[PDB]
RNA sequence: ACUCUGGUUUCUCUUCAGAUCGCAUAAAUCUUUCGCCUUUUACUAAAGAUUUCCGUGGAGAGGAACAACUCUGAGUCUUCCAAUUUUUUGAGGCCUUGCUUUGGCAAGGCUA
């Protein structure tokens, strides 16, 4: 019965995700689960040393997931 | 469920029927108080009659309009019944024949 | 489930799991005990009456309800 | 008809139809009868002979109750429709100056 | 019921749209429903519909639509929010189109109601039409679905045939009319709505799938919708949905998952509610008491189809998603609306509908209460909040930024919402919001801008109701005792009051004529009239049409005209207009407005007309959307042309006047182009004022139109008659009679019934909806519409022609007849005199 | 029997003004866009006051619902015909 | 998937009738106009006012029927959820200050 979070409204945007442990992380979202897994296009890291990650296509576990940022405009 | 039973066509044409025969159920009404033609003059004149016929017609129509625009409401009543105390005297006597 | 209909409308204090206090009237639950609190005043640690208003509260965070106060007028 | 009115081949002459079949009428005071939509399509079918195949009362247009109406106030009257007397005489006001 | 007024703080959770369509499409009956399901102690009768939202004794009586009523409610939606909605129910008679305006100039959207029998008709078409002027945002519901299955019996792929044939009908005329292609409509986008208001039915793709979603789980019901209408079919070995039909003989799949249960929902209680009813409603979940089984079909009907779809979330989340709240479709709002435009600070005010900006009200709407004495405005707040018992300054329809004189300072006592027959009172209204307004009744005539006072001194007013239709039909109104004419004098402010496009005009000969578009509206205006404004006795002269004055030949020779002081002399020459020009200026197509370059490019290049004579072009006719035009022609090489600019404008209120009313027919010159072959300006300013002038321009204007063959204009209805097939021929003759020209007869498709379109003279179209409908014996019905002026038969400068009296004039004679008679209901002289 | 009434609140709260607060201390003031089952909101024209005190501006907002603590919603929905 | 739920018919009576009492329709009296007119008794035809009559609904009361359990519904009525989103865990441990109600709290940094 697991309804998917609805983010059609958030695909192929620029958006920064928080992460779980204090984490942070910038990218392009491709897609989701009914879990808001999602897997990321052109992944920049983003840590809180300061010097910015890129990696590319990621894929990140919804339970870490704190919020969503849209950077670009929806 | 078919998408239609025996009982389709009739119940839809039972739809668009006149009045006594759209109802499932309904009250008893006298014989009295059943006019069968109520409807025939109600209509215009069929073509091709004589004279006689429609002013029988709007002499029908006339009657009609009559009692229905003095038609008043039925006054307030405390329901007191013939022949409901005439078995109540010791005069009158029940039977079937 | 009627241990908490008995509640509705009772001024209720809601301990949390960071160990806040949530001062509300329990107007509704849910499977999740998910809360709705109106007018629900937070309490910290000394203590005080953080106003908030219509608090729902997700049932992951809630630790403990209890009765403050009987149903408004 | 034994296959066509078989529902109401049993009862359709009877003095009170179904009196005492306590399914369709109340009791022996005959009254609150509750039917079924095969019979009535039935007794639909039989009667179609007596009841004006009228869909609507757009036939009714200028030849209903409202017009008889309308047409005894004005003092004139619908071709088909009734002839009634002035409803106030007004003889020296019917033809002005 | 507070979180009603709280929900108008929020601007994005209301929304004001209209329900607009034909006549008897069921917006009344829809209206009822919500009210119904809103509303738990509201429930129609068994036979009798609810009638509600209907609150005038006309409405009811004649069953026709007469005043838009407002109705303000709560509706959850699909999801579950509880969202604000106004409706104006409208009257969908086309003789009522102005009502329809008043509340379409306040409305965000547009749902419009479609017989799915009937089809589109003509005030269909017309209100698309003139919804796509205001640029409203368009939601189409076919209601009375139910009259597919109970009434036609067309088998679910003839349904669904029908129902797309309808839908791309629709589509083309909107796609006729708006060139914005984002008007597309499609049940699968959320445009498409379907609905029998009847039984209680209403659904659309999305509402259906969170039917069928609810019913098992797990189901997401928006993309389920998406693929829920069209050539798509249904596999079940896959469970998958294609292009193409796994099988043969397979059904598309809008029949297949919408068409096919509502068949067998509905046949199963007209059918066999004793005998197969039980299983199938238990089958549904539907579970109905042993008394409740015992209704008859229509009230056991929609108590199942009540049960079953439950809330009418389709109709709300139809409008939330393709209606804009008033907080974002503001903008076209004032874009279009506005006199000022966005551009000034009060429009971009106005655009962001900010509670906490300037107060701006714009009222369009009159509504009589029990005495009648006393109006009540209603309005949409554009701006900042109305308080009770607040002064607020009110404009008028004439107020500029200049004159004053218009406006009005007045107390607003206490104010409601209306939600049909009751209304709730409230101490203020936020901004986007429907309000009646009382205590602004005396200064406010038809449209009106309401402001406040002491602050926004440079506010505009809003542009004037702009109607579809050109009342033509004018009867004479007058007072049977004399001494009472005071009173039915008052009544006559009521109604010109109550009625938006009521035109209440005083001639010389002191005739109180009265414009009104066809035989129903001045009907219901002088029953308003008699029974509850004046109260007292009236009487009416035998119905005419207006009619207009034009020319059809070039003026012979160049008349002159000479101020009093023969200092200034004008000398004109008359000519008819292109044609569609005239049309072109009377639809806006071209604008006093626009600079010179642009419609001097437009004359030159759409109207093949010379360069310098399209720059010569100076006014045009009777207003600044007259059909007539007025052209100089003053050459530069013998006239000078900044001295003629400065009596130019005087020349222009000149012309206007004599545009306005005609030499022949006392008013209304239409499709007469002048130009000004000769211009004599006194030297010194005071020789040649506007007194001076203008007079002098009336009189040259009449000059040159008179000596040019004029014509008289009648109105041409355009009257379309749905009618049975074995009726056609009767109707042949019965336009034949009143010598009207057919144009069309189409069967309707899907339907057993033709449509006729013929083109009827308006003077000759008195009781010829009873006629007709009376002829065939209530099986052709009809509809008039004002369609164009034509030229009547016959020459008005004849006068060898006799009138006699009480006779019917043969062709020849009608346009003599036409303007002498008239001249007698003005009175006039008895032959226009060519010298003056 | 299947959906529970805080969902409802939730799913009225749409539209209006609402302040999220998150299980890492970040409280999100804004205008709730839309709501789920689960209580993911996506909100917009978000104010947010992290744990230092300090405030951002963050134009649309997409909350996973797991991680909230609580809503503050309107007390407008104290009327809303869920809690009747 | 349960315990109690208690019938419907019919004969009367007594009050109230709002509502098409009635998806039907009468008569009389009176008062206005009338048409005949010449005296009552019949009348002509419209309006207005009552009244009686053939009926009707509801309520209440008193019988019989006659049985009877039940119908029905108040409800617990009863035969399944540890893997991201709530209820089968990221939980626990270290450092500085403000006060210590010398138990320690609050904030931040951590480590896992």
New interface residues.
């Given amino acids: 019965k697991a309804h998917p979070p609805e983010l059609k409204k958030f695909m192929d945007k620029k958006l920064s995700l928080k992460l779980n442990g204090g984490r942070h992380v910038q990218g392009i979202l491709r897609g989701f689960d009914p879990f808001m897994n999602l897997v990321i296009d052109e992944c920049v890291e983003m840590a809180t040393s300061g010097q910015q990650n890129n990696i590319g296509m990621v894929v990140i576990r919804g339970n870490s997931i704190i919020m969503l940022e849209a950077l670009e405009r929806v | 469920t078919p998408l239609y039973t025996d009982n389709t066509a009739n119940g839809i044409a039972l739809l668009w029927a006149p009045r006594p025969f759209n109802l499932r159920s309904g009250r008893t009404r006298r014989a009295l108080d059943i006019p069968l033609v109520k409807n025939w003059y109600r209509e215009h004149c069929p073509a091709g009659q004589p004279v006689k016929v429609r002013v029988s017609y709007q002499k029908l129509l006339k009657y009609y309009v009559l009692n229905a625009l003095k038609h008043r409401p039925p006054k307030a009543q405390k329901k007191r019944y013939l022949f409901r105390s005439f078995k109540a005297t010791k005069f009158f006597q029940s039977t079937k024949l | 489930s009627s241990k908490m209909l008995q509640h509705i409308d009772y001024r209720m204090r809601c301990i949390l799991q960071d160990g806040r206090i949530f001062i509300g009237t329990f107007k509704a639950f849910d499977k999740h005990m998910n809360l709705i609190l109106c007018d629900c005043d937070e309490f910290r640690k000394r203590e005080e009456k953080r106003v908030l208003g219509l608090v729902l509260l997700r049932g992951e965070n809630l630790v403990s309800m209890t009765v403050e106060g009987p149903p408004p007028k | 008809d034994p296959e066509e009115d078989a529902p109401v081949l049993d009862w359709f002459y009877d003095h009170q139809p179904l009196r005492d079949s306590r399914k369709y009428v109340n009791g022996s005071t005959y009254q609150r009868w509750q039917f079924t939509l095969p019979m009535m399509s039935t007794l639909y079918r039989l009667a179609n002979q007596l009841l004006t195949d009228l869909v609507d009362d757009n036939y009714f247009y200028l030849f209903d109750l409202k017009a008889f109406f309308t047409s005894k106030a004005l003092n004139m009257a619908i071709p088909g429709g009734p002839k009634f007397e002035p409803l106030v005489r007004d003889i020296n006001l019917q033809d002005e100056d | ?3 009603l007024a ?2 108008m ?2 601007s ?2 209301i929304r004001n749209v209209t329900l607009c369509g034909h006549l008897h499409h069921g917006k009344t009956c829809f209206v009822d429903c919500l009210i119904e399901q809103t509303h738990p102690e509201i429930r129609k009768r068994y036979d009798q519909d609810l009638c509600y939202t209907d609150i005038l004794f006309t409405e009811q009586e004649r069953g026709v639509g007469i005043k838009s009523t407002p109705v303000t409610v709560v509706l ?1 939606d699909t ?4 969202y604000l909605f106004n409706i104006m129910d409208t009257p969908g008679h086309v003789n009522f189109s102005d009502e329809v305006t008043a509340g379409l100039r306040i409305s965000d959207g547009v749902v419009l109601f479609i017989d799915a029998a009937e089809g589109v008709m003509l005030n269909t078409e017309r209100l698309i039409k003139h919804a796509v002027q205001e640029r409203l945002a368009v939601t189409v519901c076919i209601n009375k679905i139910d009259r597919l299955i ?2 036609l ?1 067309l088998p679910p792929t003839d349904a669904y045939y029908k129902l797309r044939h309808i839908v791309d009908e629709v589509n083309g005329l909107i796609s006729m009319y708006s060139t914005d292609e984002n008007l597309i409509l499609s049940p699968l986008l959320g445009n498409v709505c379907f609905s029998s208001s009847q039984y209680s039915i209403c659904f659309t793709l999305g509402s259906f799938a969170k039917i069928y979603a ?1 019913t098992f ?2 189901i ?1 019901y928006q993309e389920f919708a998406k693929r829920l209408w069209g050539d798509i079919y249904f596999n079940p070995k896959t469970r998958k949905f294609t292009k193409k039909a796994p099988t043969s003989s397979s059904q598309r799949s809008f029949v297949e998952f919408i068409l ?1 249960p509502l ?2 929902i509905l ?2 209680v ?7 009813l039980p ?2 409603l238990d ?1 549904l979940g539907i579970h109905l008491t042993k008394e409740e089984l ?5 009230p056991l009907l929609r108590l199942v189809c009540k049960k079953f779809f439950g809330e009418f979330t389709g109709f709300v989340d139809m409008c939330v998603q393709h209606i804009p709240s008033p907080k974002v479709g503001a903008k076209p709002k004032i874009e279009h609306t506005y006199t000022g435009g966005v551009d000034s600070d009060l429009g971009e005010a106005m655009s962001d509908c900010d509670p906490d900006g300037p107060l701006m009200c714009h009222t369009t709407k009159m509504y009589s209460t029990d005495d009648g004495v006393q109006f009540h405005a209603f309005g949409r707040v554009l701006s900042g909040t109305i308080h009770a018992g607040q002064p607020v300054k009110v404009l008028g329809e004439n107020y500029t930024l200049e004159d004053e004189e218009d406006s009005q300072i007045c107390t607003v006592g206490r104010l409601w919402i209306s939600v049909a027959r009751y209304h709730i009172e409230v101490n203020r209204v936020p901004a986007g919001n429907w309000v009646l307004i009382e205590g602004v009744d005396q200064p406010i005539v038809k449209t009106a801008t309401i402001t406040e006072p002491r602050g926004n001194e440079e506010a505009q007013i809003f542009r004037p109701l702009k109607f579809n239709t050109t009342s033509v039909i004018k009867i004479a109104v007058e007072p049977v005792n004399p001494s009472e004419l005071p009173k039915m004098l008052d009544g006559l402010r009521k109604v010109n009051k109550s009625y938006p496009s009521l035109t209440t005009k005083v001639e010389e000969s002191g005739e109180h004529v009265i414009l009104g578009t066809g035989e129903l509206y001045l009907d219901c205006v002088m029953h308003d009239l008699r029974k509850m404004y004046s109260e007292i006795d009236i009487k009416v002269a035998d119905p005419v049409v207006t009619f207009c004055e034009t020319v059809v030949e070039t003026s012979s020779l160049k008349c002159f005209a000479e101020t009093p002081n023969k200092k200034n002399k004008i000398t004109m020459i008359a000519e008819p207009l292109e044609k569609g020009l005239a049309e072109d200026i009377e639809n806006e197509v071209v604008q006093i407005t626009w600079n010179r370059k642009k419609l001097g490019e437009f004359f030159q290049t759409k109207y093949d007309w010379d360069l310098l004579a399209a720059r010569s072009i100076w006014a045009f006719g009777p207003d600044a959307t007259g059909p007539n035009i007025l052209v100089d022609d003053t050459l530069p090489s013998e006239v000078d042309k900044a001295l003629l600019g400065s009596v130019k404008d005087s020349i222009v209120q000149g012309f206007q006047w004599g545009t306005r009313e005609g030499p022949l027919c006392d008013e209304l010159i239409r499709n007469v182009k002048f130009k000004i072959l000769d211009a004599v300006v006194a030297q010194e300013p005071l020789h040649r004022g506007g007194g001076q002038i203008i007079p002098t321009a009336r009189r040259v204007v009449y000059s040159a139109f008179l000596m040019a063959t004029p014509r008289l204009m009648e109105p041409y209805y355009f009257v379309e008659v749905q009618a049975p097939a074995d009726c056609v021929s009767a109707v042949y003759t019965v336009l034949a009679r009143r010598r009207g020209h057919v144009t069309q007869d189409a069967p309707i498709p899907g339907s057993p019934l033709y449509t006729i379109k013929a083109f009827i003279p308006a003077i000759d179209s008195f009781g010829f909806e ?1 006629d007709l ?2 002829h065939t ?3 052709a ?1 009809s509809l008039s519409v004002f369609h164009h002026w034509q030229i009547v038969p016959g020459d008005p400068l004849d006068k060898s022609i006799v009138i006699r009296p009480l006779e019917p004039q043969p062709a020849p004679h009608l346009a003599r007849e036409f303007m002498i008679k008239t001249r007698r209901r003005k009175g006039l002289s008895e032959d226009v005199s060519i010298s003056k | 029997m299947s959906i529970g009434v805080p969902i409802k609140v939730l799913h009225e709260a749409e539209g209006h003004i609402v302040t999220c607060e998150t299980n890492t201390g970040e409280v999100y003031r804004g205008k709730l866009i839309e709501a789920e089952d689960n209580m993911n909101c996506q909100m917009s024209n978000i104010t947010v006051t992290y744990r230092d005190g300090r405030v951002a501006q963050l134009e649309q907002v997409y909350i996973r619902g797991s991680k909230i603590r609580f809503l503050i919603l309107p007390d407008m929905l104290k009327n809303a015909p869920m809690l009747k």
């Fill in positions: 019921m507070d979180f709280d929900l703080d929020n994005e959770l959850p999801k579950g929010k509880s109970l009434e019996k609810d789980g797990d997401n096919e068949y067998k046949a199963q007209v059918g066999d509610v004793d005998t197969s299983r199938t089958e015992k209704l008859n079909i229509r009873t409908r009376t014996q209530g099986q019905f």
